[PDB]
Amino acid sequence: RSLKKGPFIDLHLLKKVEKAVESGDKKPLRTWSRRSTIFPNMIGLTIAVHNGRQHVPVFVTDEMVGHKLGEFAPTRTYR
Amino acid sequence: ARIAGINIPDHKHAVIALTSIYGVGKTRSKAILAAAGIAEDVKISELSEGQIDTLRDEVAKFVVEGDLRREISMSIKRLMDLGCYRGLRHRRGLPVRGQRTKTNARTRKGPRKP
Amino acid sequence: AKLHDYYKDEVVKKLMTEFNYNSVMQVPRVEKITLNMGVGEAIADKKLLDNAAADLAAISGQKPLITKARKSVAGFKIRQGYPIGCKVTLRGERMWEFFERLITIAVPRIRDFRGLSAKSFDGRGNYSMGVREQIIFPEIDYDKVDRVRGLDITITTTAKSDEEGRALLAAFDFPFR
RNA sequence: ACGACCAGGGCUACACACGUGCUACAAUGGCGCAUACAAAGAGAAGCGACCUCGCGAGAGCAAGCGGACCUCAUAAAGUGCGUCGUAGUCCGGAUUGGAGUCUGCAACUCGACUCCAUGAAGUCGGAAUCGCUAGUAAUCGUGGAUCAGAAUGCCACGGUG
RNA sequence: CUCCUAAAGAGUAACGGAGGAGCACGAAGGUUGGCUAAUCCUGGUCGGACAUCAGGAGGUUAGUGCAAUGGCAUAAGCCA
């Protein structure tokens, strides 16, 4: 629901992703930017998204492109 | 009569009778009747079969029928299998679009149970 | 006898070489089409079963045969011998004149058509499929409809396996999803 | 450190109970076209016309206005004609899917709005209980504060009555 | 009344071991014609472990107005 003038992604996460894909398979990416959009060059990486207390590991697939990172890290515990 | 949308619309004003199709509202019904050439205030009776074939030819342009149900089921299933926030809200029958769950979630939660 | 004539001239010699049969008698045939209508709820009232069989009488032009319960089972709370459903078996050209009446009229009518299944075979070369709606036939008018009861249709063939079975109806251009 | 800085999360949870409201269940009405009559307000990191593009939210360009001057800003119930004809309906709009707009570093948790599609409950509400004595109740729109954005709340204004 | 005790003809006792009867039916009788189960598997609208349909397996494991025993396909079983 952001305008159609381009998606948003935090710059530090962008540079982390480029350094991760250019250097081959790496460790999970620890990030707090739940608001960043999942881009096609992130397919294959597992980003550890902060959820408030932990960094939830999220293995990115082609079906996730377009979502925000926080959509795969629930912040509230309910049983 | 019957349409490429299997469903059988009632014999009443064409603009409202075409709404019985799943996927055709008022705007799309008016657009179908305009692109076909039929008035909106004429009943489904008094319509020639050549005119109903015309309406079928126009409704064939839209994905409006069990096909649309299939595309909606596919999207909800993709959400649920992805495990995203909306997927979890769909799994538990809770409101998906940010509505409050403290009170007033009766459409998604159904009749209340103690 | 449209497909009946179409049977003895066209689908025999393509099948005769498709399976390399020695005699023409080895090709599968179509003995009978039997339409079953399991009412089940007629125990509440039997006025609805006669008109239910009145529909099946209009689909095939034959007076139906009211089936009775073979044994009491309480799981559906019936006594043995209760009128539980009607059926009609079709043989000869009345089977054929009906066999084209659905494959060319019964196929292009079902709501949200997706095609028939290729797995619904008995295992020895006999096909069976169920239609959910009765207003799919030209005979039964939409105006006169007290209920939306369906019915089962099974195809009895002299085929020995499902491969020979599916090959026969495929020759009649059967929708196979 | 019970002080201070930061990022993310929460205050928005959800078996359930209550208070206060909004929208309805329709024909004294819904929809379509045409047309009539207000008051009170706000505006400079603001109100923003006209014109062009967009189905629309809006966008581009760009006057005027620190304002009895310009803008917000088309009042709506009403009235005329047509249609619907008592049905879960051309009532009702919940919910959900898809596509977008704008603000904002940033709309995932958790914004408002638009378009297409879908069309829950609801057919007047048990025990009980509330407000109101006249331009009042009832009903219909309008504006402002807070405010980047976010009113069914609050505070005010007039129409019918 | 039926079975066992009862000792391969009959019969055979106990406060021995187990069960039933004190009816039903004008068809559930007569005759002629026809028919052949139980159960399970597979496929099939609602339909489900279990309804009706189709096929295969199976071969009487079913049925017999009612206890048990002996019978029953030429059916004594089922239908007209």
Residue C59 and residue C144 in contact, taking contact as beta carbons nearer than 8 Å: no
- Tokens 């089940």 label which residue? C40
In the structure encoding, which two tokens stand for residue C156, read together? 């009895």
Helices (H) and strands (E) in chain B, counts: 6, 0
Three-state secondary structure call for residue C131: strand
Distance CA(C67)–CA(A58), nearest Å, equals 61
Q: Which of A70, A12, A60 has the alpha carbon at shortest distance from A39? A: A60
> Can you state the angle between helices B49-59 and B26-36, rounded to 10 degrees?
120
Experimental method: cryo-EM
Strand D nucleotides, any atom under 7 Å from protein beta carbons: they are 7-19, 83-85, 90, 94-98, 100-104, 106-113, 115-120
Going by their DSSP bridges, the two strands A46-50 and C65-68 should be labelled as unpaired
Domain ranges of chain C: 1-177
Distance CA(C155)–CA(C32), nearest Å, equals 7
Residue C139 DSSP class: S
Distance CA(A37)–CA(A8), nearest Å, equals 6
Three-state secondary structure call for residue C28: coil
Answer yes or no: CATH 3.30.930.10 is held by domain C1-177: no
Interface of C with B in 93-132 (CB under 8 A): 110-112
Flag if C112 and B8 touch (Cβ within 8 Å): no
Q: Could you tell me the resolution of this structure in angstroms?
A: 2.7
Q: Which residues of B20-39 are buried (b: 16+ CB within 10 A; e: fewer)?
A: ebebbeeebbebbbeebebe
Q: Which of C70, C96, C93 has the alpha carbon at shortest distance from C83? A: C70
Distance CA(B72)–CA(B80), nearest Å, equals 12
Q: How many other CB atoms sit within 10 Å of the CB of residue C153?
A: 19
Q: How many residues does chain A have?
A: 79
Residue A5 and residue A27 in contact, taking contact as beta carbons nearer than 8 Å: no
Three-state secondary structure call for residue C103: helix
Strand E nucleotides, any atom under 7 Å from protein beta carbons: they are 38-39, 42-56
Q: Which residues of B95-111 are buried (b: 16+ CB within 10 A; e: fewer)?
A: eeeeeeeeeeeeeeeee
Handedness of CA C92, C97, C99, C100 (dihedral sign): positive
> Using the CA of B26, which nucleotide's C1' is the nearest one?
D90
